[PDB]
């Protein structure tokens, strides 16, 4: 369940109930131990153009941000960033790699 990486289907930007429940637990844990800040970075595969992917990455990051806000984390303490297709961690040549690029990274910055 719990992971810093949240995955999405091809061209999708929402969260199913299992994902939302997992993310609520992460959010509530961070709230409980009085963490200052969470940074949510949205990402895409490189299919489609820069702008298309930029906006998709923003929608993904916002979906995750909303779960943190609903759990009680103030918006002022959440940094939401879409990086589009620019910072892959896996191989866009393959389905498996593209799948691992379709993500939000949950970060607790120092």
CB 72 within 8 A of CB 27: yes
Three-state SS string across 15-65, please? CCHHHHHHHHHHHHHHHHCCCCCEEEEEECCCCCCHHHHHHHHHHHHHHHH
> Rounded distance, CA 15 to CA 64, Å?
8
CB 78 within 8 A of CB 40: yes
CA-based torsion, 24, 43, 56, 6: positive or negative: negative
Resolution for this experimental structure (Å): 1.4
20 is written with which tokens?
């939302």
Q: Where are the domains of the chain?
A: 1-110
Q: Which of 1, 6, 90, 2 is nearest to 41 (CA)?
A: 6
H or E segment and range at residue 6: strand 5-7
Rg (CA), the chain: 14
Q: Is 8 helix (H, G, I), strand (E, B) or coil?
A: coil
CB 4 within 8 A of CB 25: no
CB 97 within 8 A of CB 91: yes
Query: DSSP secondary structure string, 54-98?
Result: HHHHHHHHHHHHHHHHHHT--GGGEEEEE-TTSS-SS-TTSHHHH
Class assignment of domain 1-110? alpha beta
CB neighbours (10 Å) of residue 34?
6
In the block, residue with structure tokens 């979906």: 63
CB neighbours (10 Å) of residue 106?
21
106 is written with which tokens?
């949950």
In the block, residue with structure tokens 């120092």: 110
């Amino acid at each position: 369940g719990m992971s810093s990486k949240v995955l999405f289907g091809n061209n999708l930007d929402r969260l199913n109930p299992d994902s939302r429940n997992t993310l609520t637990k992460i959010a509530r844990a961070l709230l409980a131990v009085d963490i200052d800040k969470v940074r949510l970075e949205g990402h895409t595969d490189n299919y489609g153009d820069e702008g298309y992917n930029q906006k998709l990455s923003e929608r993904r990051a916002e979906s995750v941000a909303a779960v943190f806000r609903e759990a009680g984390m103030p918006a002022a303490n959440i940094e939401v960033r879409g990086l589009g297709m620019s910072k892959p961690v896996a191989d866009n040549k393959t389905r498996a790699g593209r799948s691992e690029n379709r993500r939000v990274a949950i970060i607790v910055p120092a």
